[PDB]
Amino acid sequence: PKVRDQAGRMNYYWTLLEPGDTITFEATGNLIAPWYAFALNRGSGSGIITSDAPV
Amino acid sequence: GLFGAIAGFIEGGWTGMIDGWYGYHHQNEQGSGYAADQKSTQNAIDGITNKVNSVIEKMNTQFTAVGKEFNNLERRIENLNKKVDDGFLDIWTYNAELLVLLENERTLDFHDSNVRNLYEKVKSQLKNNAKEIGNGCFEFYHKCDDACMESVRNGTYDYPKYSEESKLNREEI
């Protein structure tokens, strides 16, 4: 069925590439390549909350 | 009053006394007044302080706990997770409330008990030299004065020093 006017679908994927590791992409179509990626700084006791209170 | 003193044989409180939780009333010819008892009051103070702190220490403060998301094929484990959240919440709610109920009774008992101790500690000092005139009151068989009033609250009242006087007084009844 058309969703946001699209009979096509696209699956999004993620992964944590560890220091030193290499990630290789091979394709003959259908790849939505990474353009920008994110280097992560681990904290702790952060989190996600759902709120409509103002900052 | 489980110890029969408070709301018991000593019917009322003394909005007059503001020195402390436990104290004496006196009326020597020189005048009237209130004087709270240091030793007992400071004890009760200390103890009840310890009691609140001890209860609160047993509560580790809560650290970051944010809920977890699940997708629609994860209903069992989303339900497992709710079961845990609800299960611990019941237990802490029950512990908190139940403790406070039970310990409130103990605290009030404590106060009742301290008061009875006080009274009886005086009573064992006076004996003959005064009579049980009701509602935690003694009546001196001898005349006594403000500085003498301080011997009572001292826990050092000299029973012999007035035993003579009180004897011939009491014996006129």
Ligand SMILES: *[C@@H]1O[C@H](CO)[C@@H](O[C@@H]2O[C@H](CO)[C@@H](O[C@@H]3O[C@H](CO)[C@@H](O)[C@H](O[C@H]4O[C@H](CO)[C@@H](O)[C@H](O)[C@@H]4O)[C@@H]3O)[C@H](O)[C@H]2NC(C)=O)[C@H](O)[C@H]1NC(C)=O
């Ligand atoms: C950012 O988020 C907002 C959502 O807050 C989003 O805008 C919203 O998107 C939907 C989809 O475009 C809009 O609802 C549509 O309104 C149009 C025009 O009036 C209707 O024709 C649409 O109905 C048709 O398509 C539906 C399926 O997609 C069918 O259910 C329906 O039967 C019709 O065929 C549809 O309801 C909505 O108007 C806005 N909301 C607001 C407040 O504007 C925006 O698209 C998002 N942007 C990005 C980049 O993701």
